[PDB]
Design a binder for these strands. Structure first.
Ligand code: MG
Ligand code: MG
Ligand code: MG
Ligand code: MG
Ligand code: MG
Ligand code: MG
Ligand code: MG
Ligand code: MG
Ligand code: MG
Ligand code: MG
Ligand code: MG
Ligand code: MG
Ligand code: MG
Ligand code: MG
Ligand code: MG
Ligand code: MG
Ligand code: MG
Ligand code: MG
Ligand code: MG
Ligand code: MG
Ligand code: MG
Ligand code: MG
Ligand code: MG
Ligand code: MG
Ligand code: MG
Ligand code: MG
Ligand code: MG
Ligand code: MG
Ligand code: MG
Ligand code: MG
Ligand code: MG
Ligand code: MG
Ligand code: MG
Ligand code: MG
Ligand code: MG
Ligand code: MG
Ligand code: MG
Ligand code: MG
Ligand code: MG
Ligand code: MG
Ligand code: MG
Ligand code: MG
Ligand code: MG
Ligand code: MG
Ligand code: MG
Ligand code: MG
Ligand code: MG
Ligand code: MG
Ligand code: MG
Ligand code: MG
Ligand code: MG
Ligand code: MG
Ligand code: MG
Ligand code: MG
Ligand code: MG
Ligand code: MG
Ligand code: MG
Ligand code: MG
Ligand code: MG
Ligand code: MG
Ligand code: MG
Ligand code: MG
Ligand code: MG
Ligand code: MG
Ligand code: MG
Ligand code: MG
Ligand code: MG
Ligand code: MG
Ligand code: MG
Ligand code: MG
Ligand code: MG
Ligand code: MG
Ligand code: MG
Ligand code: MG
Ligand code: MG
Ligand code: MG
Ligand code: MG
Ligand code: MG
Ligand code: MG
Ligand code: MG
Ligand code: MG
Ligand code: MG
Ligand code: MG
Ligand code: MG
Ligand code: MG
Ligand code: MG
Ligand code: MG
Ligand code: MG
Ligand code: MG
Ligand code: MG
Ligand code: MG
Ligand code: MG
Ligand code: MG
Ligand code: MG
Ligand code: MG
Ligand code: MG
Ligand code: MG
Ligand code: MG
Ligand code: MG
Ligand code: MG
Ligand code: MG
Ligand code: MG
Ligand code: MG
Ligand code: MG
Ligand code: MG
Ligand code: MG
Ligand code: MG
Ligand code: MG
Ligand code: MG
Ligand code: MG
Ligand code: MG
Ligand code: MG
Ligand code: MG
Ligand code: MG
Ligand code: MG
Ligand code: NA
Length: 139
RNA sequence: GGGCGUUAAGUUGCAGGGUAUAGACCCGAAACCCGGUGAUCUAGCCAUGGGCAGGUUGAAGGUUGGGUAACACUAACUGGAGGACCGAACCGACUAAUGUCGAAAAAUUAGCGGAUGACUUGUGGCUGGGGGUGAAAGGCCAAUCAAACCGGGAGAUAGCUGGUUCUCCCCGAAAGCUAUUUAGGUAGCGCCUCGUGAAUUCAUCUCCGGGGGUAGAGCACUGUUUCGGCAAGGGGGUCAUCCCGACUUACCAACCCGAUGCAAACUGCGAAUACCGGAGAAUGUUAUCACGGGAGACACACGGCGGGUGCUAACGUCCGUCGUGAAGAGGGAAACAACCCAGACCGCCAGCUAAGGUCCCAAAGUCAUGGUUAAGUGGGAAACGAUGUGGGAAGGCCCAGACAGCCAGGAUGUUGGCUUAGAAGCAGCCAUCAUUUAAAGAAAGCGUAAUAGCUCACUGGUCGAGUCGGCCUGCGCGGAAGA
RNA sequence: ACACAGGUGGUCAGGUAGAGAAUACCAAGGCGCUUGAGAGAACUCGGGUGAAGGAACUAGGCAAAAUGGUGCCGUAACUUC
RNA sequence: GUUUAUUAAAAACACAGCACUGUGCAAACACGAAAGUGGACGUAUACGGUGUGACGCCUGCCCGGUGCCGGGAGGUUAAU
RNA sequence: AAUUCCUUGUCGGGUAAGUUCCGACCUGCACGAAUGGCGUAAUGAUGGCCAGGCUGUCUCCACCCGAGACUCAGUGAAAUUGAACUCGCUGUGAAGAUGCAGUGUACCCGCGGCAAGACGGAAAGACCCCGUGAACCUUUACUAUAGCUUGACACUGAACA
RNA sequence: UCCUCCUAAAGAGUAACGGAGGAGCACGAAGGUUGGCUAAUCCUGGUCGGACAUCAGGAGGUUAGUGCAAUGGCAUAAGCCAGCUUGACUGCGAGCGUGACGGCGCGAGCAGGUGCGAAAGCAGGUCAUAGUGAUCCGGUGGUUCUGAAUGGAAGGGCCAUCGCUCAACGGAUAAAAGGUACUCCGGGGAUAACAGGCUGAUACCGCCCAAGAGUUCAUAUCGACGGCGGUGUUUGGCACCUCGAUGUCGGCUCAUCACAUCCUGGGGCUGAAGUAGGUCCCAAGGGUAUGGCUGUUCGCCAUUUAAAGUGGUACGCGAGCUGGGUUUAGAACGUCGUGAGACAGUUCGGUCCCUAUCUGCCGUGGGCGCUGGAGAACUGAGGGGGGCUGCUCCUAGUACGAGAGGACCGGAGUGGACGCAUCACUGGUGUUCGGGUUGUCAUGCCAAUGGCACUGCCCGGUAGCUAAAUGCGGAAGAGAUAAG
RNA sequence: CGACGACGUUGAUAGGCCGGGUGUGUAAGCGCAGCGAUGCGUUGAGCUAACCGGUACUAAUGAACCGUGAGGCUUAACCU
RNA sequence: UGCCUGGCGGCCGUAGCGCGGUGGUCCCACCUGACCCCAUGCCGAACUCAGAAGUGAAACGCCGUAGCGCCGAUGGUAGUGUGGGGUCUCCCCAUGCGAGAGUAGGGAACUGCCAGGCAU
RNA sequence: GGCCGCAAGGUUAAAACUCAAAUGAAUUGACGGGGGCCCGCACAAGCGGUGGAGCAUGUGGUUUAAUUCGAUGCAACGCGA
RNA sequence: CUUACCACUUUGUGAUUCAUGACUGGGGUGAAGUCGUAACAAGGUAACCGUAGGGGAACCUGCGGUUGGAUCACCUCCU
RNA sequence: GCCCGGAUAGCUCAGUCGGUAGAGCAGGGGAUUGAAAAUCCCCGUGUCCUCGGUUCGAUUCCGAGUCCGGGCACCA
RNA sequence: AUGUUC
């Protein structure tokens, strides 16, 4: 229920229910609801802004069209493991969907290249000057 | 000196208890090993005969004619290969329904795959049990297969269930310790019973001799803890470089000092109760101890008290002590082993009581006296809330008039000089009755930026006689929602 | 185990339509499957039909429906021709 | 094509092809206490085992480990 | 992906909506080259997905034809079964009551039918644990052993260097 | 296995997968004896030398040390330092403590032979408790022992002593790993999975204090740090029932109950202008979606609805149905393992039985009763069924509002779903009516018919039954209340 | 299945019959045209199940059986 | 017989610290010297010996002094055996036992044998 | 895309898009870790030094209020001074 | 009234073409960047052509081919 | 919820058994070069994680915290 | 001997 030094998941918006797992187990998996179905609204949730407008904007299999982080944690057996695991997946995915890429600063050409350009310009011009038709005043 | 003996009479039957070896209280395995019967189903093979309606495609090749130096190549006709196609018999078993004490220990109905083959089938033969065979599933080997069937070892073994058969009488436990490839068995001991022997032996109570370190308490000690003083040393720098700063020596700060607590692994203190002795009275069917025969038992549960663990959860678990149930009926707690009373030898159409009860179901008080409760509280629940209602002690205000009503004044410097573009009697830190009378602020809730104003705090007038809160308290109410 | 919807090798194998030992109706031949008689309810079994819609049922078009023969025209990607 | 008769008919087994490898024929190997028989009245273009499973493109690195093959120098080593 | 936990990854397609499907991306938990890798026309009672058609599979079932079912006559079983004069509820209780407590209802008795209960019937639970139980199977568990293999001795001798 | 503390309830003992530590040794001096001595740590000065070296004095009090853990001790020291020495002896041992036993432990004194001391005296190991191993089988030495005819001897015995992380430490063998989903047998609810039960940590719900947010204002709403409960819906805990069987996910069909109400119905506050909301009381009468994906409860999504409630009922219901999943035996992929095999990891395939006796319930009768007998019609105790609601319009562009927008209250009409009834319509069916038609057999033959082929395949179709077809119902009203 | 409703010769209870309806859809035979298949006339005929209105033609027969004979006792309002 | 001192015991903080004072005929104490018995893990510091000059300074002993330590009642409280009760993770009643700390207060020790000196 | 190939590939054979060049021969030069001659304290042969220490001096750097400006490779760094 | 013809239209299956598509292979340009030096002299291993293999890339290696590659008698005679 | 190996100059690491600071890289300053490389010389780096017990001494020993990969958290 | 780049 914690992300960073300032962003905290207040846990008042963490609608966890317990469903019956999918897979093997015999007569325990049929009858012991252990898959943690974690639901976590995003819009009306009291996380800081710049989180809501980013989570809702991004497209991820967990977050629904109503804007609810949906987790189906059934990778472990007992509800303590599944609850800690679903909370871990939620923490991780909110971390990952709230980290932003750094702003690529687009560079300018080097001053060495600018002077190389101007020197090539001057060299071809120095050639072209004495190139071509010569002027005269005599006949 | 010490260990073992030294005093006693054994022995032979008979009956009985126990042990030991024999199956040894009976029934009950999975299996193991022998010696044999099985390939008339089935897996494979061998030999010898059978079966495959009908309809499709149409290869190689062959002929012919081109085309080639010759091939090559190509066209037509021909021919009929194929684990080829469609499909009946035949073989099989993919889907579904039915059937599931069926018609059938696996079928039937409708569909389905192969259907000239690595096919199918008839007759006969061969391969055999840790062996056969296997287009491999651990499949099949006579409805039986991760080692067939029959007989024998064999009554295997079974620390495991189940059962144990007539009667009466006396005594009558344990589910603990220790040890265990040991935990659900067993052995010794503790507990039971039957004998033998031995002492005031043992028990109860009283007095006396005792040692504890628990409850309690305490902080001299080990840790811990909050304050305040004491605080030098750490301390930022505004200690200025080698020397340092009366300020920071606010912070920290050991100890000390004074107090405040806490502890199972703390004790400068320390009970009750148990326990060990000594002595004595009374009582107790000698209940004590030693030896000998026979055991059972070593899965205990609850309740009270002291505790560990758990969450001061569990009808949880693990201990100590006691009791009960187990192995104890009866009365009571509606029913309810373990809670309360009480320990049933048999009979009685007798009586007194215990716990519990007395209006009716249901035996007994509509008992007596004095109170409380108004909620079915009694007859389920906490924090908390409440002018519910008894009782107490005390305090405040009161016939110089008490509290509440009542028409009603309560204010000019008080926008106060005052972030003053308002915080105006009532959004500013600051204060600022500071005159007037009995009273009245440089004032609370409102337009609150306040004038425009409201009430308001306070005094007076009537009314007149109780009133104000606060505490202890007893019984109550709300909090109090479930299939 | 039964007077058991099972299994059992070989031969003969007619007419009409059909390619035909499939199939449908028949001849020679054989049998009416060893309890019946009523009634005409649920419900089950084997079936027929269905408005409108058409997989919305569902695990899944299981089932059921549908197509289905001969002759002629045509017949794509892909290909090991 | 075959399979779990009697709940699995498949992606499982087989399969033609491929490779490794043993085997010189009294073959290897197997059933046999042995004789013998199969292999096979076969002879390396053949047999047995192993793995993969038509066809096309292919099949990369490691010999440290375990196994197999080769060595015999040395060490250790049995009966005697 | 027959391999992928996160996972319903992301993207595109398909659908109005697609955890499956198809095509890609690669972050391959844990593909990978004859214990084969990749692709592949044909084949497949093979697995997944889609569309056309078709229909009672379905909203939503309705009617009808037969065989049972039901009544009559004949023959006539079975599983099960302590006994029975065999109610509901709330509670108690070896902790999910026909039987106990309290209470309410219910004249005795059949026939058709349903199946919630009688912890219904069937199978001394195939799950789990225990047995100082068993079987098979695996292996660099232990102990052996068949077989394969070395050497000595024997059958086995001679001459020579 | 052993040692120490606590738990341990003031004799001993006393358990737990309770809380804390340690040992598997060391030392011929770290023992004995005689003699002697007394710390740690602060303060003050002193070459290096100081935070802390050895140095001197004061304070202190054992707060040091005891070879090693903890406890009990220790100053007469058991601590520290010196000289001599080996009593770290040999044979015994009154008594006693502790053990079920095996054993363990303390021991004054006696005989011998010693050390220390002047001597009394002390000394058979260390301040104590840990530092360990039963028997068997053997080894080596010694020996008044035995010695298979006799003498030897081998061997055996007694004494000394050696070899066992036999540490699973009372030690089953000198010698020991696994799979079984191919399983089998004996048992257990003594002991697990589901279900039930006890509890409620967890979960869900409510309440208390409430700083603060809310342009100001704690409460329109939310509520920080904290606190008190309730429910028995999850996950748990425990193992009470069931292991001589209680079938388990989901689905379908059938419901039933609670209210902690999703809609409808009635209210309060509102940061409620109106519509619309938010929240909190009352309320269970009725209603509460179809689809795509997945086996899914769950969820996402599309589209509706007035609403798409939360829960109990063996997380209802399989002697009602399915079997996709989970769970058999086949097979494969990834991974692990050398291998058998294994995987709450996938993937393809995979037998779901029962004739209802009782209770229950849906209907339906027989007997008898109710008092002469009989046929009718009823009263009505009591019980059951039913109770849902949208849209449009008028009220009215009215109230309100700046305008967009837009009422309450009250009427009307048409729908949705549900139920009852019926066949006049629309139809379906209608194998019992009529016709068409393929093949074939027969009626001698043409014609006409009949049989059989699913009713042969079809086209129609009467009555009846029926829904998709039509009509009708939810009331209005009254009484007594709920919140208010 | 019991049951419930109707009727049992003074009868429409069922069956049949007549008529009607409804449905199917122009029967067979005959005649004509056509070589024939077929078509046309008779001919909206024929058949018509449960429906409707009637009609004793058949069957619902006289009977027999069960149920009987004034209804307990005691108290109370009256003629007695 | 009384004072003082020495040695050895009783008891082991009422019995000890701290402050203040007193002793030197005797005893004790320091002290002289270490030549000798003897010792210093170096040193007559310690021991040891031979001595007595001086000293009561320390130490020792004696008398006041509570400043401290220490002892500490009566009551009450906690706790508890036993038997009941409850509003039962803790209390109450009856009865029995009765703390710890604290309070008033106490408290500057008492005592035995022998030896010596002093005074009788 | 076609035809061919088993395959690697071959063969037939474009366009979008950009660039004002891409090229061939030949001259002069520069360069070669190309050749051939020839030379200079270039190497070799030697002698003595620098880098090592201190100092003077100048720069680079850092600092300052400025540390004035300029050279900055041989050809600046006891340089203009 | 009906018979053949044929528009329009509806099927089913192709053909071609146009636009479009996750992702991808190359290309060109820009080029300020990174890693190398392959080529140009004997470019320091001559280069290049074909072909096959490998590698991060220029390219490297193998087989064959071309010169569009620079000196080419470095212990010698007298022949 | 732990547990297996772990916390070391500026960095990759070594390395012992109480009395360790060792290697390599890198870096700096030179040497060369026209200059950057590449090379050739010279130079020095930590108290062995915040710690908390022990010991006369902590990196070598036992426990909280960074958690490195992870290992397990399975059975009906 | 190999021995890059502005
Ligand atoms: Mg599993
Ligand atoms: Mg065996
Ligand atoms: Mg035989
Ligand atoms: Mg067929
Ligand atoms: Mg066929
Ligand atoms: Mg045969
Ligand atoms: Mg198998
Ligand atoms: Mg068989
Ligand atoms: Mg066997
Ligand atoms: Mg025997
Ligand atoms: Mg037996
Ligand atoms: Mg008795
Ligand atoms: Mg036991
Ligand atoms: Mg046992
Ligand atoms: Mg205490
Ligand atoms: Mg303390
Ligand atoms: Mg204590
Ligand atoms: Mg026990
Ligand atoms: Mg018993
Ligand atoms: Mg009793
Ligand atoms: Mg009783
Ligand atoms: Mg009773
Ligand atoms: Mg009770
Ligand atoms: Mg209350
Ligand atoms: Mg018969
Ligand atoms: Mg038969
Ligand atoms: Mg036939
Ligand atoms: Mg019959
Ligand atoms: Mg019928
Ligand atoms: Mg049909
Ligand atoms: Mg019909
Ligand atoms: Mg239809
Ligand atoms: Mg239709
Ligand atoms: Mg359609
Ligand atoms: Mg669907
Ligand atoms: Mg089908
Ligand atoms: Mg069909
Ligand atoms: Mg096949
Ligand atoms: Mg076969
Ligand atoms: Mg089968
Ligand atoms: Mg078969
Ligand atoms: Mg294969
Ligand atoms: Mg390979
Ligand atoms: Mg090798
Ligand atoms: Mg070898
Ligand atoms: Mg996906
Ligand atoms: Mg998608
Ligand atoms: Mg894909
Ligand atoms: Mg391989
Ligand atoms: Mg393969
Ligand atoms: Mg009968
Ligand atoms: Mg009950
Ligand atoms: Mg039934
Ligand atoms: Mg049963
Ligand atoms: Mg069993
Ligand atoms: Mg004790
Ligand atoms: Mg005790
Ligand atoms: Mg001594
Ligand atoms: Mg100093
Ligand atoms: Mg010692
Ligand atoms: Mg010791
Ligand atoms: Mg032994
Ligand atoms: Mg002899
Ligand atoms: Mg043992
Ligand atoms: Mg043991
Ligand atoms: Mg043992
Ligand atoms: Mg398997
Ligand atoms: Mg039990
Ligand atoms: Mg359970
Ligand atoms: Mg505020
Ligand atoms: Mg509030
Ligand atoms: Mg149990
Ligand atoms: Mg448990
Ligand atoms: Mg228990
Ligand atoms: Mg139960
Ligand atoms: Mg069970
Ligand atoms: Mg309510
Ligand atoms: Mg109600
Ligand atoms: Mg009503
Ligand atoms: Mg409802
Ligand atoms: Mg459950
Ligand atoms: Mg269920
Ligand atoms: Mg069933
Ligand atoms: Mg179910
Ligand atoms: Mg049931
Ligand atoms: Mg199948
Ligand atoms: Mg299936
Ligand atoms: Mg009702
Ligand atoms: Mg009609
Ligand atoms: Mg009709
Ligand atoms: Mg009809
Ligand atoms: Mg005829
Ligand atoms: Mg005819
Ligand atoms: Mg016939
Ligand atoms: Mg019709
Ligand atoms: Mg009303
Ligand atoms: Mg008529
Ligand atoms: Mg006509
Ligand atoms: Mg006619
Ligand atoms: Mg007292
Ligand atoms: Mg006291
Ligand atoms: Mg080309
Ligand atoms: Mg030189
Ligand atoms: Mg230098
Ligand atoms: Mg120099
Ligand atoms: Mg110059
Ligand atoms: Mg090159
Ligand atoms: Mg070169
Ligand atoms: Mg190069
Ligand atoms: Mg080159
Ligand atoms: Mg290479
Ligand atoms: Mg950790
Ligand atoms: Mg450089
Ligand atoms: Mg270095
Ligand atoms: Mg570069
Ligand atoms: Na190898």
């Amino acid at each position: 229920i914690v992300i960073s030094r300032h962003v905290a998941i207040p846990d008042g918006e963490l609608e966890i229910t317990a469903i019956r797992a999918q897979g093997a187990g015999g007569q325990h998996v049929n009858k012991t609801s252990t898959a943690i179905h974690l639901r976590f609204d995003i819009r009306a949730s009291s996380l800081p802004e710049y989180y809501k407008e980013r989570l809702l904007a991004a497209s991820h299999h967990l977050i629904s069209s109503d804007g609810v982080i949906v987790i189906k944690a059934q990778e472990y057996r007992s509800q303590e493991l599944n609850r800690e695991a679903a909370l871990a997946r939620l923490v991780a995915m909110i971390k990952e969907l709230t980290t932003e890429k750094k702003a690529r600063r687009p560079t300018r050409p080097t001053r060495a290249s600018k002077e190389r350009r101007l020197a090539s310009k001057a060299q071809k011009s120095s050639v072209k000057a004495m190139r071509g038709k010569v002027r005269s005043g005599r006949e």
